Amino acid sequence: VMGIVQDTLTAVRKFTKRDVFLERGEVMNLLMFLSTWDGKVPQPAILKPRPLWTGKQIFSLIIPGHINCIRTHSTHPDDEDSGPYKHISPGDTKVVVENGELIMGILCKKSLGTSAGSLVHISYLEMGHDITRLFYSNIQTVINN
């Protein structure tokens, strides 16, 4: 019944877009707003020429436990699944969460909203109300910052 709304949702989709790259100071600033952070900085997606992280890495740190979920973005073409490039997505419109990490996809209403089978719903049903509350707070704080 509760979901991610407004500024947080609009910035989640931009954060989860493929071409978003974060550098070191921004990564530390975002990581301070995680309550459930274990204090270990993850390996960046790009190590050379310069260390660059991706928004999917930070949101995978936000994701609690070992949630497994598959959703689709709102702009997902209907012909991608039938034809080739089914698991190598051109538009990054297929959300796949494996072992608590965001492998691919762009988050939107259809994955973080108040709909059945959402990431929030699976997080609740697999982890419990306390961990889902921490999930909500971490999403809002990190994305708003």
Partner 1 sequence: AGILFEDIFDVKDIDPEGKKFDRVSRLHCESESFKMDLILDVNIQIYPVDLGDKFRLVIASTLYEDGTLDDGEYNPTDDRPSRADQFEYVMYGKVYRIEGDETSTEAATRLSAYVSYGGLLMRLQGDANNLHGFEVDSRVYLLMKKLA
Partner 2 sequence: RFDYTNERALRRTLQEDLVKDVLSNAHIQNELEREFERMREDREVLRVIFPTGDSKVVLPCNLLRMIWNAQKIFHINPRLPSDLHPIKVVEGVKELS
Partner 3 sequence: MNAPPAFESFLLFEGEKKITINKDTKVPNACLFTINKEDHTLGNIIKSQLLKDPQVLFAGYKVPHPLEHKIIIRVQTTPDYSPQEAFTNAITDLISELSLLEERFRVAIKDKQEG
User: Footprint of partner 2 on this chain (CB under 8 A)?
Assistant: 66, 68, 98-99, 122, 125-126
Which listed range, 4-12, 54-62, 109-117, 120-128, lies at the site for partner 1 (CB under 8 A)?
A: 54-62
Contacts (CB under 8 A) with partner 3, residues 28-87: 28-29, 31-33, 38-41
Interatomic CA distance for residues 33 and 31, integer angstroms = 5
Give residues with Cβ within 8 angstroms of 125, minimum separation 6: none
Closest listed residue to residue 64, CA positions, set 7, 10, 116, 142: 142
Closest listed residue to residue 13, CA positions, set 101, 82, 112, 81: 112
Regarding 100 and contact with partner 1 (CB under 8 A), the answer is no
Q: Which of 11, 65, 70, 92 binds partner 1 (CB under 8 A)?
A: 92
Interatomic CA distance for residues 101 and 79, integer angstroms = 26
Interatomic CA distance for residues 2 and 118, integer angstroms = 11
Q: Which of 1, 6, 25, 49 binds partner 3 (CB under 8 A)?
A: 25
Interface with partner 1 by CB under 8 A: which residues? 17-19, 21, 40-57, 87-92, 96, 98-99, 101-104
Interface with partner 3 by CB under 8 A: which residues? 24-25, 28-29, 31-33, 38-41
